[PDB]
Amino acid sequence: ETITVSTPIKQIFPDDAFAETIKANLKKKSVTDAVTQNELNSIDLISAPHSDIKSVQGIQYLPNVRLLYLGGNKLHDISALKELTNLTTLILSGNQLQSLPNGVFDKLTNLKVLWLSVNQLQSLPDGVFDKLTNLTSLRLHRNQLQSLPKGVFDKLTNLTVLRLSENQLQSLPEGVFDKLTQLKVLWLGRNQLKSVPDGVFDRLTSLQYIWLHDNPWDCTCPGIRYLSEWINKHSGVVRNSAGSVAPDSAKCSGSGKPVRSIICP
Amino acid sequence: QCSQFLRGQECVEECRVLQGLPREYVNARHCLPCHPECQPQNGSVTCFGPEADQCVACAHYKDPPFCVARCP
Ligand SMILES: *[C@@H]1O[C@H](CO)[C@@H](O)[C@H](O)[C@H]1NC(C)=O
Domain boundaries, chain A: 97-265
**Are the beta carbons of A187 and A159 closer than 8 angstroms?**
no
**Are the beta carbons of A66 and B42 closer than 8 angstroms?**
no
Check if B20 contacts A (Cβ < 8 Å).
Answer: no
Resolution reading in Å: 2.0
**Are the beta carbons of A162 and A185 closer than 8 angstroms?**
yes
Q: Which residues pair with A115 in a beta bridge?
A: A91, A139
CA nearest to A158 within chain B: B43
The per-type count for chain B, helices as H runs and strands as E runs, is: 0, 6
Single out the residue of A127, A129, A134 nearest to residue A157, CA to CA. Answer: A134
In a mutational test of the pocket of ligand 1, which residue from B16, B19, B42, B56 has the highest number of ligand atoms less than 8 Å from its CB? B42
**Superfamily of structural domain A97-265:** Ribonuclease Inhibitor (3.80.10.10)
b/e sequence B3-25, b meaning 16+ C-beta within 10 Å: eebbbeeeeeebbbbbeeeebbb
Cα–Cα dist A172/A200, whole Å: 9
The stretches of chain A forming alpha helices (DSSP H) are 9-12, 16-26, 37-41, 225-233
φ, ψ dihedrals at A9, nearest 5°: -50, -50
As for how many domains chain B has, the answer is: 1
Q: Tell me the shortest Cα–Cα distance from B72 to chain A, in angstroms.
A: 19
Cα–Cα dist B31/A140, whole Å: 22
Q: Tell me the shortest Cα–Cα distance from A243 to chain B, in angstroms.
A: 7
Cα–Cα dist A69/A53, whole Å: 12
Query: In Å, how far are A199, B56, B62 from B21, measured between CA atoms?
Result: 39, 16, 21
Single out the residue of A153, A165, A94 nearest to residue A128, CA to CA. Answer: A153
Ligand 1 centre and the CA of A88: distance in Å?
Answer: 9
Handedness of CA A76, A180, B27, A212 (dihedral sign): positive
**Strand order through the sheet with A137-139:** A45-47, A67-69, A89-91, A113-115, A137-139, A161-163, A185-187, A209-211
SS3 of residue A224 by DSSP: coil
